[PDB]
Write an enzyme that holds these catalytic residues in place. Sequence first.
Site, PDB file in Angstrom:
ATOM      1  N   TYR A 140      42.256  34.532  28.514  1.00 11.71           N
ATOM      2  CA  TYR A 140      42.275  34.891  29.927  1.00 11.71           C
ATOM      3  C   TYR A 140      42.221  33.613  30.727  1.00 11.71           C
ATOM      4  O   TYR A 140      41.416  32.727  30.428  1.00 11.71           O
ATOM      5  CB  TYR A 140      41.091  35.787  30.295  1.00 11.71           C
ATOM      6  CG  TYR A 140      41.012  36.037  31.781  1.00 11.71           C
ATOM      7  CD1 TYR A 140      41.780  37.028  32.372  1.00 11.71           C
ATOM      8  CD2 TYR A 140      40.198  35.257  32.596  1.00 11.71           C
ATOM      9  CE1 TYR A 140      41.733  37.257  33.739  1.00 11.71           C
ATOM     10  CE2 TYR A 140      40.132  35.478  33.966  1.00 11.71           C
ATOM     11  CZ  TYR A 140      40.900  36.478  34.533  1.00 11.71           C
ATOM     12  OH  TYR A 140      40.839  36.693  35.898  1.00 11.71           O
ATOM     13  N   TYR A 146      39.849  44.639  40.399  1.00 14.53           N
ATOM     14  CA  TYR A 146      40.334  45.344  39.213  1.00 14.53           C
ATOM     15  C   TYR A 146      40.188  46.848  39.374  1.00 14.53           C
ATOM     16  O   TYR A 146      39.810  47.555  38.435  1.00 14.53           O
ATOM     17  CB  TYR A 146      39.588  44.854  37.967  1.00 14.53           C
ATOM     18  CG  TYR A 146      39.673  43.353  37.824  1.00 14.53           C
ATOM     19  CD1 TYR A 146      40.916  42.708  37.846  1.00 14.53           C
ATOM     20  CD2 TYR A 146      38.522  42.572  37.743  1.00 14.53           C
ATOM     21  CE1 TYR A 146      41.003  41.320  37.743  1.00 14.53           C
ATOM     22  CE2 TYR A 146      38.606  41.182  37.624  1.00 14.53           C
ATOM     23  CZ  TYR A 146      39.844  40.573  37.642  1.00 14.53           C
ATOM     24  OH  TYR A 146      39.945  39.197  37.547  1.00 14.53           O
ATOM     25  N   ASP A 195      40.895  25.211  29.219  1.00 12.87           N
ATOM     26  CA  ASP A 195      40.388  25.972  30.352  1.00 12.87           C
ATOM     27  C   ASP A 195      38.891  26.183  30.124  1.00 12.87           C
ATOM     28  O   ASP A 195      38.495  27.043  29.330  1.00 12.87           O
ATOM     29  CB  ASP A 195      41.140  27.296  30.469  1.00 12.87           C
ATOM     30  CG  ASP A 195      40.675  28.129  31.635  1.00 12.87           C
ATOM     31  OD1 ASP A 195      39.625  27.809  32.241  1.00 12.87           O
ATOM     32  OD2 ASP A 195      41.363  29.125  31.929  1.00 12.87           O
ATOM     33  N   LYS A 204      33.877  28.177  38.405  1.00 15.43           N
ATOM     34  CA  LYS A 204      32.725  29.096  38.320  1.00 15.43           C
ATOM     35  C   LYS A 204      31.369  28.389  38.497  1.00 15.43           C
ATOM     36  O   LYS A 204      30.910  28.264  39.626  1.00 15.43           O
ATOM     37  CB  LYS A 204      32.779  29.903  37.008  1.00 15.43           C
ATOM     38  CG  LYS A 204      33.843  31.030  37.019  1.00 15.43           C
ATOM     39  CD  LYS A 204      33.600  32.061  35.906  1.00 15.43           C
ATOM     40  CE  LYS A 204      34.560  33.262  35.986  1.00 15.43           C
ATOM     41  NZ  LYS A 204      35.816  33.103  35.183  1.00 15.43           N
TER      42      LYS A 204
HETATM   43  C1  LIG Z   1      36.998  33.013  35.725  1.00 10.06           C
HETATM   44  C2  LIG Z   1      38.065  32.315  34.938  1.00 10.06           C
HETATM   45  C3  LIG Z   1      39.315  31.774  35.523  1.00 10.06           C
HETATM   46  C4  LIG Z   1      39.651  31.850  36.990  1.00 10.06           C
HETATM   47  O1  LIG Z   1      39.480  33.123  37.574  1.00 10.06           O
HETATM   48  P1  LIG Z   1      39.205  33.178  39.159  1.00 10.06           P
HETATM   49  O2  LIG Z   1      39.118  34.654  39.398  1.00 10.06           O
HETATM   50  O3  LIG Z   1      40.395  32.526  39.827  1.00 10.06           O
HETATM   51  O4  LIG Z   1      37.906  32.437  39.379  1.00 10.06           O
HETATM   52  C5  LIG Z   1      40.218  31.117  34.699  1.00 10.06           C
HETATM   53  N1  LIG Z   1      40.010  30.944  33.389  1.00 10.06           N
HETATM   54  C6  LIG Z   1      38.913  31.398  32.750  1.00 10.06           C
HETATM   55  C7  LIG Z   1      38.739  31.187  31.274  1.00 10.06           C
HETATM   56  C8  LIG Z   1      37.881  32.135  33.499  1.00 10.06           C
HETATM   57  O5  LIG Z   1      36.807  32.611  32.854  1.00 10.06           O
HETATM   58  N1  LIG Z   2      38.603  36.728  37.588  1.00  6.63           N
HETATM   59  C1  LIG Z   2      37.324  36.343  36.955  1.00  6.63           C
HETATM   60  C2  LIG Z   2      36.803  37.294  36.046  1.00  6.63           C
HETATM   61  C3  LIG Z   2      35.441  37.263  35.757  1.00  6.63           C
HETATM   62  C4  LIG Z   2      34.883  38.165  34.853  1.00  6.63           C
HETATM   63  C5  LIG Z   2      35.671  39.119  34.226  1.00  6.63           C
HETATM   64  C6  LIG Z   2      35.080  40.012  33.315  1.00  6.63           C
HETATM   65  N2  LIG Z   2      35.864  41.247  33.300  1.00  6.63           N
HETATM   66  C7  LIG Z   2      35.741  42.222  34.202  1.00  6.63           C
HETATM   67  C8  LIG Z   2      36.623  43.134  33.861  1.00  6.63           C
HETATM   68 CL1  LIG Z   2      36.929  44.646  34.664  1.00  6.63          CL
HETATM   69  C9  LIG Z   2      37.237  42.689  32.792  1.00  6.63           C
HETATM   70  N3  LIG Z   2      36.720  41.506  32.487  1.00  6.63           N
HETATM   71  C10 LIG Z   2      37.038  39.155  34.506  1.00  6.63           C
HETATM   72  C11 LIG Z   2      37.600  38.240  35.409  1.00  6.63           C
END
Ligand SMILES: *Cc1c(COP(=O)(O)O)cnc(C)c1O
Ligand SMILES: NCc1ccc(Cn2cc(Cl)cn2)cc1
Lengths: 429, 429
Positions: free
Chosen positions: A150, A18, A247, A276
């Site tokens: 998300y 990011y 999810d 996770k």
């Molecule tokens: C972390 C997460 C994902 C998947 O993100 P990755 O970066 O591919 O591990 C999908 N859905 C939710 C709600 C999450 O918190």
């Molecule tokens: N792709 C997995 C993941 C895990 C934690 C977070 C938390 N987050 C980090 C930022 Cl920058 C915004 N949100 C965002 C995405």
Amino acid sequence: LTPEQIIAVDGAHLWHPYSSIGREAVSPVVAVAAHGAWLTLIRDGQPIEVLDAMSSWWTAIHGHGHPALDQALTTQLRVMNHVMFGGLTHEPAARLAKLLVDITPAGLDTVFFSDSGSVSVEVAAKMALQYWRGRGLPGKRRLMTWRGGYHGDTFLAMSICDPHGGMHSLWTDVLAAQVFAPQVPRDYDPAYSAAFEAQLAQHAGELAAVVVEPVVQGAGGMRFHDPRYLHDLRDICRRYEVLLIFDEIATGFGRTGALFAADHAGVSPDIMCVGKALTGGYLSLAATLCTADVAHTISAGAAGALMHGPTFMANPLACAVSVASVELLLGQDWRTRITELAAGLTAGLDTARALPAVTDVRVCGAIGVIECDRPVDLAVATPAALDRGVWLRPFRNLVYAMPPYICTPAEITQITSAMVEVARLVGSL
Amino acid sequence: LTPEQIIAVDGAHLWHPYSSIGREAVSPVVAVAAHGAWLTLIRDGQPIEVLDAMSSWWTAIHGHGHPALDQALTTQLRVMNHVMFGGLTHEPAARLAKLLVDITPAGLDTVFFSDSGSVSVEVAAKMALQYWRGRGLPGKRRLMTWRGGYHGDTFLAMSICDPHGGMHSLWTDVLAAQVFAPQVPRDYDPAYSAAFEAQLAQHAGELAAVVVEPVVQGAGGMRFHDPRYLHDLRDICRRYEVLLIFDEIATGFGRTGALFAADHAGVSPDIMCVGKALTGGYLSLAATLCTADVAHTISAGAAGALMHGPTFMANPLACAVSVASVELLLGQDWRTRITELAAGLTAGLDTARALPAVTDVRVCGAIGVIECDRPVDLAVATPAALDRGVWLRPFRNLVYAMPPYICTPAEITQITSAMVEVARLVGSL
Ligand SMILES: *Cc1c(COP(=O)(O)O)cnc(C)c1O
Ligand SMILES: NCc1ccc(Cn2cc(Cl)cn2)cc1
Ligand SMILES: *Cc1c(COP(=O)(O)O)cnc(C)c1O
Ligand SMILES: NCc1ccc(Cn2cc(Cl)cn2)cc1
Ligand SMILES: NCc1ccc(Cn2cc(Cl)cn2)cc1
């Protein structure tokens, strides 16, 4: 490599999450060890011990280097690192599948393994779309969700991210155009569910599925909502023949105080994603579960096989350490542990409510959140946390923790104290 | 679990790649060990050792349980299993990034790690689209490729698989519509390149990138093409201002006789994907590399950070074993090894040309292919190869091998003999 060498290579060649490479104000901190709830980080040339208050992005539920999980990995390494799942099967996949079907909400009896959360969401969507193709209704091809959500970073996962405030908002013009209900409120309001149903009913003929995070929306804002909304979604989806996808990649394995967040509502989705904390934070792994009916219908009509097959699908090493992590969770009184964690977070964060830059303080299971009145400056927050022996990673306006379940009460209070002090500095100059 | 217990659980609960659960004629074979080039599989309740002729879907280049790679994993495990890459960095990521930038085609100096090949392709596409956004040209958002290709199973990746007779062909009506040039021929024909150019030219203003597999197209049909076509693509992309992306997830790390298949042509892409053999087949990991120009033009721009961040990004365990795998490859005369393998495959497969159901026999580096005139029945092929001590996994009309680099001449002779017999049986019905 020395820490300075690591920094040099990192600055020259590594892209971090990011971020804009070469343009980040706060450079990464070198990590050189992790043991239990603690990380060893390099600060000003010196190693310091700090609590992993983030559980390494919500994964390390048993801490780092747990002997049960370490040994599960090395035991499997000795016998079979990996074989292709195209044509072969094996004990770790079987053991993990059996565990997952037994502990997830009722009716989820089939398991598709993949290598990351985002992929497991893509698989869930493919399952839902192919289900309706199998029913001879290929017009049911859109997804519906509520705002604030998300679901990962691959392009179909991005399409159900919050369109205005979500991290993927700049991509709206090239993403699949999905259906969005308003932000689900914290408190239960029957008017919200009635409006959700009205919106879904207008689109039901073109909807494959509703996809939501149950109870806790994580990356989109650490927002909590009343579990009764999930009961309503289940009912609405049933009556209008729209599949329900949960999810649980962030909420799973005890994090919200129930084994899965759906359990707070007593609801079973048709399809569920986990990841996770699945591996205890050792290795990347995810899974998509569905009902027998979904699985069989997916290849009904002319729809054929589910054409998905990650190269490292059902990786023996990842599956073996997941089996150990899940068995370790189930073999203790995890419900009491999380209840104690939640109480520690609540007690420790209470003084933050009175701080001038704090707009809300909230706790759900082993999730503690201070919501601030402005974006949190990492250049201020990171030193402040490290100075108090805690690794925190704020995002947007949130100072939050999702600590390892093995944290002692003293460690939880150390974490909350650091969070309060970070929040005090947000509202300082 | 016993093999029969594994079979029962697997049948009830596990979804296998590219399959219709509960409707597959050939059930998975239980694998109970792997070591070196060999798998221990269960046949009629009994454990048999057979050669992993597929390298477990083209990953196990040093074989299973290689002591150097085993040790690398166990060493890292004792120190630090995993930390989040959001805010932290570490020695395994730095070591691997340095290795990858050093050994890849010239100009690739930036590494974005992810958890799987399909994700790395989505990251490559995102880089390409965001690049042109950084140049103020957001209309450049389509991809172009040739037919016969494969790039993974997530929804963007699916869109550059061949829509006519490719594995994702049923999804055409849902996927992003990309630009496809005709199938690239085996032999070099400058007319093909001129036609590719004329087609690209018409679309140049709406194209972000050309994406191809260099030299060998794997999952889409094990087709080989003259490397000079890559030289032409580099020139065409240069002159018409379209990015060039090479997907080397199957071709990387020596498999085609060069370290990377691009090296056969002596050109460098703007963006490159690697995976599969990256970890020596131990764990899921992938990477997307790009040039300094691409990296810095993203976030120039008004277009901001690259919003991608896999939870297990740059996982220390997976990075550590990859570092060992790459160093093990570079520390030996791998070029001679692959040459010897290619010679063994050619000698062993030669008699297959005369078989009645065989349309072509071809070898490229450590890849050997018998193409048949009809689909290969797994129910016949699998027992036949197993009884000859070889694990083969044909698909469509292809009997092929991508053996571990550690295979002895005797082992290659055994693998090719099994391949020839499978092809012989194909022409019996
Ligand atoms: C972390 C997460 C994902 C998947 O993100 P990755 O970066 O591919 O591990 C999908 N859905 C939710 C709600 C999450 O918190
Ligand atoms: N792709 C997995 C993941 C895990 C934690 C977070 C938390 N987050 C980090 C930022 Cl920058 C915004 N949100 C965002 C995405
Ligand atoms: C294997 C492969 C991929 C990625 O597939 P995954 O199933 O995600 O590992 C992408 N491109 C090519 C050319 C491949 O061979
Ligand atoms: N997703 C990685 C991957 C690896 C190997 C193959 C080979 N293949 C298997 C079938 Cl079925 C068709 N092709 C197909 C996909
Ligand atoms: N130089 C390595 C290499 C590159 C391409 C191919 C495939 N091919 C070779 C010819 Cl000649 C035409 N096609 C075979 C080997």
